[PDB]
Structures are given as C-alpha cells and as structure tokens.
Structure 1
Amino acid sequence: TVRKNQATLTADEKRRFVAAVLELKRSGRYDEFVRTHNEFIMSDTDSGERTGHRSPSFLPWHRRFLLDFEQALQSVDSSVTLPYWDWSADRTVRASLWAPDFLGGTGRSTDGRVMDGPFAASTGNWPINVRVDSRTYLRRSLGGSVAELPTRAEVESVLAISAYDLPPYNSASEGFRNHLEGWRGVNLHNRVHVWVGGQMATGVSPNDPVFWLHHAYVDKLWAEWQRRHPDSAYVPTGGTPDVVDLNETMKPWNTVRPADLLDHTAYYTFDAL
C-alpha cells in the first residue's frame, strides 16, 4: 500500500479513487465515518475524557480512522489507496486537487455551494446527510475564513519540536502534537479545516472527501517528525486520567493502542518520506 501525493495521481487513479468514494457513499458506509468523527469531536474535552482530538491520541486515532476508511475503499477497489494533500505546496485554488476531475472547486459566494466535480450536489451523488447545518449540499469557501494555508517554513518550525506532547496533554499543551493540531502556535491542521470552510470547518468535516487527504498529510507529518526525532516517542506512557497512554486501548475500536500505530510501515508507506 503506497500513499501518494494527490498532485501525482494519474487520471486513472483519480477516476478509481472518486468511484470508490462514491460507492461508499451510495452504500451508506461513508456517512457512518462522518457520524463517528462528529461523535468524538463533541465528546473530546480539555478537562475530561479526550481521545480523537485535543490530546496525544489525536495522531494515532486519526491514523486508525484513516486506515478503516482506506480498507473500506479497498473493499470496493483493491487498487485504491488514500492520497495526501500537501497544503504547504498545493496552496491555491488553482491546484489540480480542486479541478472538476478530482474534488471540484470552491463554492459559490451566495451559499457556499460547490458547483463542479463529482461531489457537487447537482450530480445527485453526494447528499449531505449527517449534518448540523441543515443544508444538504457540499459547501466550501477556499481561503474565505482565513487567508493562507500553512507554508513549508511554518511546517518545519513545528517538525523541529522535540517533545511529542506535554502535560496537560490538551489544547493548552506545548509540544509537537498540539502545534501540529494547531491550538497553539502558527497553526497547521486546524487552520486547514478553517481555510476549506463549508462542512470541513465543522464536526461533520468528513462530509468533504478532502478531509481524508488533509488528514493523510497530517499523518505523513507525524511520520516525518518521527524520522527527525528518532530519540523521541509517544507520551504519556502510563497512568494518565482521561488521556490514552501509549499501551492503553482507544475508542471506538477498543482493540488497538497508540503503540500499535506508531510504525505506519506495518500498514502502508509513502511515495517519499
């Protein structure tokens, strides 16, 4: 399994990825990923139990969530793997990512509605069902709510942080995980959600297929961090209330721990790391 930069996919690979995503939507499986993510972001809190966000397990949780989604794609077309979006490089609305043969573009200004590409509401193939905003069409406002995506120099400054995470292991933490997540510092992952807008800015953000490509690149940045800091590792390592320690299992699966997910190469490699 090789996860490839979206910018590098062949026309055949884009066609096959889109058709697999549309089939998971048609079959009803896709919307349960959206529901699971919203359930965790509504329950993950800074002073209580926190697993999928604002906590050290943000990274292994999303790694396993993406693995579940990739396996579901492979059950439809075994050649498909999740691509990643390097938003530091492909940083404008002209990026091929946003072309009509791939994810389609930004939404129109009046109501945010995406008007082209395979996920446009007009196709009939991308109903927004799991939602809080009652509107049922995919929406985006690229660069509307924040003007720029992170740059490579900004990503580099976060990659250079030696500690994986630090007490109090939440949105106030210093350390790599919270700087990558974005609640402190120059802000990488959260800012990308805000920059896409529409459903990507909400707890039902997997409603936009770009969710997976964003989180596949976040996941790659974890892998790069590890290679920069072979001497540093996941923390905490035991006995921490409300936080998933290294060898503790994680909801909702219950049968996997951060320890099982640190080495991505048991599951996939990157085109280049």
Structure 2
Amino acid sequence: TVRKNQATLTADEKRRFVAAVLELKRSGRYDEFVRTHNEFIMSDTDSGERTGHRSPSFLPWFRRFLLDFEQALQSVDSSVTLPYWDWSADRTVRASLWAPDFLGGTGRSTDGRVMDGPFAASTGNWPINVRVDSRTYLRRSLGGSVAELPTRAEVESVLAISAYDLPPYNSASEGFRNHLEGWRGVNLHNRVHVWVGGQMATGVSPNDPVFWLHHAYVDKLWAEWQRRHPDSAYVPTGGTPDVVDLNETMKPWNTVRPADLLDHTAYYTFDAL
C-alpha cells in the first residue's frame, strides 16, 4: 500500500479514487465516518476525556481512522489508496486538486456552493446528510476565512520540535503534537480546515473528501517527525487521567493502542519520506 501525493496521481488513479468514494457515499457507509468524527469532536474537551482531538492521541487516532477509511475504499476498489495533500506546496486554488476531474473547486460567493467536480450538489451524487448547518450541498470558500495555507518553512519549524507532546496534553500544550494540530504556534492542521471553509471548517468536516487528503498529509508529517526525532516517542506513557497513554486502548475501536500505530510501515508506505 503506497500513499501518494495527490498531485502525482494519474488520470486513472483519480477516476478510481473518486468512484470508490462515491460508492461509499451511495452505500451509506461514508456518512458514518462523518458521524464518528463529529461525535469525537463534540466530546473531546481540554478539561476531561479527550481522544480524537486536542490530545496526544490526535495523531494515532487519525491514523487508525484513516486506515478504517482506506480499507473501506479498498473494499470497493482494491487498487485505491488514500492520497495526501501537501498544502505547503499546493497552496493555491489552481492546484490540480481542485480541478473538476478530482475534487472540484471553490464555492460560489453567494452561498458557498461548490459548482463543479464529482462532489457538486448538482451531480445528485453527494448529498450532505450528516450536518449542523441545515444546507445539504457541499460548500467551500478556499482562502476565504484565512489568507494563506502554511508554508514549507512553517512546517519545518514545527517538525523541528523535539518533544512529542507535553503536559497538560491538551490545546494549551507546547510540543510537536499541539503545534501540528494547530492550537498553538503558527498553526498547521487547524488553519487548513479554516482555509478550505464550508463543511471542512465544522465538526462535520469529513463531508468534504479533501478531509482525508488533509489528514493523510498530517499523518505523513508525523512520520517525518519520527524520522527526524528517533529518540523521541509518544507520550504520555502510563497512568494519565483523561488522556490515552501509549499502551492504553482508544475509542471507538477499543482494541488498538497508540503503541500499535506508531510504525506506519506496518500498514503502508509513502511515495516519498
């Protein structure tokens, strides 16, 4: 299994990826991923139990969540893998990512509606069902709520941080995880959500297929961090209230620990690391 930079996909790879995602939608399986994410997002809190966001397990949790998604894709087309979006390189609305043969572009300025691509409401193929905003069409406003995606240099500064995470292991933490997540510092992952806009800025952000490519790149950055800091490892390592320790199991699967997800090469490799 090789996860590739989206920008390098062949036409056929794009076609099969799109088709696989659209079948997961049609069959009802896609929306349950949306719902799972929204639940963690509404439940994870800085002062209490926190698993999927704002905590050290943000990165292994998303790695397993993406694995779940990737295996569902492969159940439809076994040749499909999750591509990643390097938003530090492909940072304008003209990137091929946003072409009508892949994810489609930005929303119109009146109502944010995406009007092209396979996930446009007008296709009849991408109803927004799991939602808080009652509108049922995919929306985006690329670069609307924040002027720029993170730069390579900004990613580099985050990758330079040696400590995986640090007490109090939440949105107030110093350390790599919180800088990557974006709650402190120049802001990587959170800012990308804000930049895309539409459902991607909300708790029901997996409504936009770009969600998976974003997190696949976030996941790649953790892999790079580990290669930069082989002496650094997941923390905390035992007995921490409200937080998933290294060998503790994580909801909602209950059967896998951060420890089982540290080494991505047990599940996949990248085109380049």
Secondary structure of the residue aligned to 1:32 is helix
User: What CA distance in whole angstroms lies between the structure 2 residues aligned with 1:70 and 1:239?
Assistant: 32
| Cα deviation 1:185-243 (Å, max 9, x = unaligned) | 00000000000000000000000000000000000000000000000000000000000
User: How far off is 1:100 after superposition?
Assistant: 0.1
Q: How far off its partner does 1:27 sit? A: 0.1
What's the CA shift for 1:152? Answer: 0.1
Distance 2:168 2:177 in 1: 12
How far residue 155 of structure 1 moved from its aligned partner, in angstroms, is 0.1
> Which residue of structure 1 aligns with residue 46 of structure 2?
46
Structure 1 residue ranges, 4+ long, deviating more than 3 angstroms after superposition = none
Q: How far apart, in 1, do the equivalents of 2:65 and 2:137 lie?
A: 24
List gaps (5 residues or longer) in structure 1: none
Task: Name the CA distance, whole Å, in 2 between partners of 1:119 and 1:28.
Answer: 15
TM-score (norm 2): 1.00
Q: Give the drift of 1:262.
A: 0.2
Distance 1:48 1:166 in 2: 16
Return the alpha-carbon distance in structure 2 between the equivalents of residues 212 and 126 of structure 1.
Answer: 16
Equivalent residue number for residue 263 of structure 1: 263
Partner-residue secondary structure (3-state), 2:91: coil
Work out the CA distance in 2 between the residues paired with 1:221 and 1:45: 24
Counterpart for residue 231 of structure 2: 231
- In the alignment, the residues of structure 1 paired with residue 196 and residue 202 of structure 2 have an alpha-carbon distance, to the nearest angstrom, of 11
The 3-state SS of whatever aligns with 2:41 is helix
Equivalent-residue separation in structure 2 for 1:61 and 1:112 (angstroms)? 30
Deviation per residue, 1:146-196 (Å, 9 max, x gap): 000000000000000000000000000000000000000000000000000
Deviations 1:39-67 (A, max 9, x none): 00000000000000000000000000000
Query: Per-residue CA shift, 1:82-130, capped at 9, x if unaligned?
Result: 0000000000000000000000000000000000000000000000000
Aligned length: 273
Distance in 2 of aligned mates of 1:202 and 1:2:
29
SS in 1 for 2:249: coil
Report sequence identity in percent: 100
Unaligned runs of 5+ in 2: none
The Cα RMSD (Å) is 0.1
C-alpha distance in structure 2 between counterparts of 1:101 and 1:264, whole Å? 30
1:235-258 Cα offsets, whole Å, 9 max, x none, are 000000000000000000000000
Distance 2:202 2:257 in 1: 27
2:37 partner SS = helix
Separation (CA, whole Å) in 1 of partners of 2:253 and 2:204? 20
In structure 1, C-alpha distance between the alignment counterparts of 2:140 and 2:41, rounded to whole Å? 20
- 1:72 deviates by 0.1
Structure 2 match to 1:98: 98
In 1, distance between residues paired with 2:61 and 2:229?
21
Distance of 1:75 and 1:228 partners within structure 2: 34
1:8 CA displacement: 0.1
Give the secondary-structure state (helix, strand or coil) at the position aligned to 2:38: helix
- TM-score for both structures, normalised by structure 1: 1.00
